[PDB]
Amino acid sequence: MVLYFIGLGLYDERDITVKGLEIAKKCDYVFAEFYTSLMAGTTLGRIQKLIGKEIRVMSREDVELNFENIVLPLAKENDVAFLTPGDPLVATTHAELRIRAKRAGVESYVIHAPSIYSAVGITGLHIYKFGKSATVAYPEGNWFPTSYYDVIKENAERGLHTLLFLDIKAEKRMYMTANEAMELLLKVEDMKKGGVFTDDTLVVVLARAGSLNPTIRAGYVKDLIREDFGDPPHILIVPGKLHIVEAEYLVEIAGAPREILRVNV
Amino acid sequence: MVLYFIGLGLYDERDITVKGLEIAKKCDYVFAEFYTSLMAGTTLGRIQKLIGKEIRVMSREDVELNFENIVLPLAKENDVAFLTPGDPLVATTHAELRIRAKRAGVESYVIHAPSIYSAVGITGLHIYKFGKSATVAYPEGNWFPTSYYDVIKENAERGLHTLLFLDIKAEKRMYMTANEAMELLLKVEDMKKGGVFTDDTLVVVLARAGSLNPTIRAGYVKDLIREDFGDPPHILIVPGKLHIVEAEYLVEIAGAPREILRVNV
Ligand SMILES: Nc1ncnc2c1ncn2[C@@H]1O[C@H](CSCC[C@H](N)C(=O)O)[C@@H](O)[C@H]1O
């Protein structure tokens, strides 16, 4: 009769909360999805061992089209968990899953966990200054999507930071790197020429948030576009004008060039 | 000689991540602050029992003025942890503390935890649609803060949602309720008359996120301004333009008036 939405956190199997782990261990059935994001610092095997339950992995279609026939039936007379990377209900379409639960006469509860939305705070950029967020998608065939470029434009114009998620094809396990994201953005700039993303734009790269040894780098596109940020996933941020305190953190912690202390403040 | 910034999460001691607990259990000294937020479902004793350590609680002054004198000295020869509610670097000025650690020659690591910033996902509002965030501060003497009103205005103009952190004065054990925030906003509207926040404005209230039964309510200010949302902490959210599914969730899950289902596009 109960469905638990449980977040797995940012990087490895230890990123789940004590509450989430204990509730998971008490569930009769455990489902999970790894198409929205992938726990880069662990494996399905390590997660299964930690929880001590077999985990029924679900594809995007399994969730979006058949959540009510794969998960809810069992949740009708059993305690069931639905695990997701990060914090539950962050993925755009997940909140609607609680409506499906209600319609099926199933109670649902949310067990939160760390999300990149809040973890980006490790970049030293003030959370209140982030504006609209967006995802950088790979162009394909005749389709060249660029809305993420306009998001950056509108935020920066108002002195706000722009959090950019990078493309991911979970099944094929192919991640977009910050480097690719930058090259793509320079290409969009050459097209729209809005003076939004250029070689002189200051950017911040966060790789493997959640691990004890994450890669936090800041600098100008001209110097970071070919830098090695390590293994994915990578998150790209285009900060708005900086607070001197944000700039000092980027210089002292993220190795940003002292130049930002005068140019981007 | 390491310093760990470890978040404790949204509501109770079980909101800490497994990673954070295991690392906290093995630290030589443990410090913490409980003035940046309120963890309504736990006590200092419960947290201490969980990590099996005595916790040296610090005031805002101990931290902001004496962090390098109270915490860092020990972090130079021991493994020290500094615990905080939610995520340690979200809507706090704790990030600058890492710069202090660096200057004292102390390495620091950050262990994230669920934060109110991402927990907004439980309101059904698409998290990528949130714009600039703000804090509703208690007026003091002849000083009446109003900047948060302009933030709402700016976001609303762009069709973006506005997350409003609410004031807190731990030493006075004062925690601003969503009701008090609504009253202050109506007063600012009376002054600026921008048509930004009125009795007909749709708002969302999230109280005690992290608990199994948080209060999630959506409706017009005129109807919610006097509604009892339970014990603090609370956050107030002023949505921008709603997607059909955001409206459906507010109605089905947050008990919003069915009339908001009809969205003006
Ligand atoms: N569990 C909770 N439920 C509702 N609001 C919360 C909350 N925890 C924090 N807040 C909101 O945030 C304010 C503190 S701001 C500090 C936030 C913290 N670092 C985090 O990551 O969550 C509170 O005054 C309140 O308005």
Q: What is the DSSP string of A42-82?
A: S-HHHHHHHHTS--EEE-HHHHHHHHHHHTHHHHTSSEEEE
Which residue(s) pair with A234 in the sheet? A207
CB contact under 8 A, A102 and B128: no
Cis before B114 (ω within 30): no
Which residue(s) pair with A58 in the sheet? A33
Measured at the CA of B188, the angle between CA B182 and CA B190, to 5 degrees, comes to 105
Measured at the CA of A263, the angle between CA A154 and CA B94, to 5 degrees, comes to 80
Determine whether the annotation assigns residue A21 to a binding site: no
The answer to whether residues A207 and A234 touch, using CB atoms and an 8 Å cutoff, is: yes
CB contact under 8 A, A18 and B19: no
The CB of B53 under 6 Å from ligand 1? The reply is no
Single out the residue of A94, A99, A105 nearest to residue A31, CA to CA. A94
Distance CA B101, CA B74 (A): 11
Single out the residue of A227, A226, A225, A217 nearest to residue A260, CA to CA. A217
**Cα nearest neighbour of A109 on chain B:** B212
Q: What are phi and psi of A166, to 5 degrees?
A: -105, 150
Assign domain B1-114 to its CATH architecture: 3-Layer(aba) Sandwich (3.40)
Q: How many helices (H) and strands (E) does chain A have?
A: 11, 12
The answer to whether residues B112 and A113 touch, using CB atoms and an 8 Å cutoff, is: no
Distance CA B129, CA B222 (A): 25
**Which residue of A16, A23, A126, A127 to mutate against B (max B Cβ within 10 Å)?**
A127
CA of B90 to the centre of ligand 1 (A): 9
Structure-block tokens of residue B242? 């709603």
Distance CA B69, CA B58 (A): 12
Say which residues have a Cβ less than 8 Å from residue B66's Cβ, sequence separation at least 6.
none
Distance CA A44, CA A106 (A): 27
The answer to whether residues B15 and B8 touch, using CB atoms and an 8 Å cutoff, is: yes
Structure-block tokens of residue B149? 């009103």
Which residue(s) pair with A236 in the sheet? A164, A205
> What residues does each domain of chain B span?
1-114, 115-265
What's the distance, Cα to Cα, between the start and end of chain B in Å?
A: 57
Structure-block tokens of residue B255? 């008990």
How big, in percent rounded to 5, are the helix, strand and coil portions of chain B?
40, 25, 40
C-alpha distance from residue B19 to each of A117, B41, B239 (Å): 19, 21, 35
Distance CA B216, CA B50 (A): 29
Cis before B232 (ω within 30): no
Count of residues making up chain A: 265
Question: What per-residue string of b and e applies to A119-143 under the rule 16 or more CB within 10 Å gives b?
Answer: bbbbbbbbbbbbbbbbbbbeeeeee
Q: What is the DSSP string of B177-194?
A: -HHHHHHHHHHHHHHH--
Structure-block tokens of residue A126? 């003030």
Structure-block tokens of residue A225? 């576009």
| Nearest neighbour of B87 by CB, restricted to A19, A121, A154 | A121
Q: What are phi and psi of A101, to 5 degrees?
A: -60, -50
> Which residue of B12, B235, B236, B238 sits with most ligand 1 atoms within 8 Å of its CB, as the best mutation to test the pocket?
B235
Distance CA A86, CA A10 (A): 5
The CB of B16 under 6 Å from ligand 1? The reply is no
Which residue(s) pair with A2 in the sheet? A79, A107
Residues of B in contact with A212 (CB under 8 A): 19, 109, 111
C-alpha distance from residue A26 to each of A20, A52, A79 (Å): 10, 10, 8
Distance CA A112, CA A7 (A): 5
The DSSP letter of residue A243 is P
What's the distance, Cα to Cα, between the start and end of chain A in Å?
A: 54
The CB of B229 under 6 Å from ligand 1? The reply is no
> Which residue of B5, B17, B37 sits with most ligand 1 atoms within 8 Å of its CB, as the best mutation to test the pocket?
B37
Q: What are phi and psi of A130, to 5 degrees?
A: -75, 140
The DSSP letter of residue A40 is T
Distance CA B57, CA A37 (A): 37
Exposed/middle/buried for B43, CB within 10 Å: 0-12, 13-18, 19+? exposed
The answer to whether residues B219 and B255 touch, using CB atoms and an 8 Å cutoff, is: yes
- Give the nearest ligand 1 atom to B210 CA: 1
Compute how many other C-beta atoms are within 10 angstroms of the C-beta atom of residue B240.
Answer: 19
Half-sphere exposure of A145 (CA within 13 A, CB side): 12
| Beta strands B174-175; B168-169: pairing state | antiparallel
Angle between the N-to-C axes of helices B96-103 and B60-70, in degrees from 0 to 180, rounded to the nearest 10: 20
| Beta strands A215-220; B168-169: pairing state | unpaired
Reported for B218-226, long-range contacts at CB under 8 A and 24+ positions apart, including other chains, are B218/B123, B218/B250, B218/B251, B218/B254, B218/B255, B218/B256, B218/B260, B219/B255, B219/B256, B219/B257, B220/B257, B221/B182, B221/B186, B221/B197, B223/B257, B224/B178, B224/B179, B224/B182, B225/B179, B225/B182, B225/B183, B225/B186, B225/B199, B226/B179
| Beta strands A2-7; A79-84: pairing state | parallel
The answer to whether residues B29 and B1 touch, using CB atoms and an 8 Å cutoff, is: no
C-alpha distance from residue B5 to each of A136, A219, A251, B28 (Å): 31, 25, 20, 14
H or E stretch at B147? helix B147-157
Structure-block tokens of residue B59? 């005031």
The answer to whether residues B152 and B238 touch, using CB atoms and an 8 Å cutoff, is: yes
How many CB pairs lie under 8 A apart between chains A and B?
183
3-state secondary structure at position A236: strand
Give the fold, CATH level 3, of A115-265: 3.30.950
The answer to whether residues A43 and A57 touch, using CB atoms and an 8 Å cutoff, is: no
The answer to whether residues B224 and B210 touch, using CB atoms and an 8 Å cutoff, is: no
Region of residue A229 (phi > 0: left; psi between -120 and 50: alpha; otherwise: beta)? alpha
3-state secondary structure at position B49: helix
C-alpha distance from residue B250 to each of A95, B2, B243, B247, B253 (Å): 10, 45, 11, 5, 6
Say which residues have a Cβ less than 8 Å from residue A200's Cβ, sequence separation at least 6.
A220, A221, A222
Q: What is the DSSP string of A87-123?
A: STT-STTTHHHHHHHHHTT-EEEEE----HHHHGGGG
Distance CA A36, CA A90 (A): 10
CB contact under 8 A, B253 and A99: yes
Measured at the CA of A99, the angle between CA A98 and CA A100, to 5 degrees, comes to 90
Most distant CA atoms of chain A, gap in Å: 62
Distance CA A128, CA A122 (A): 14
The CB of B133 under 6 Å from ligand 1? The reply is no
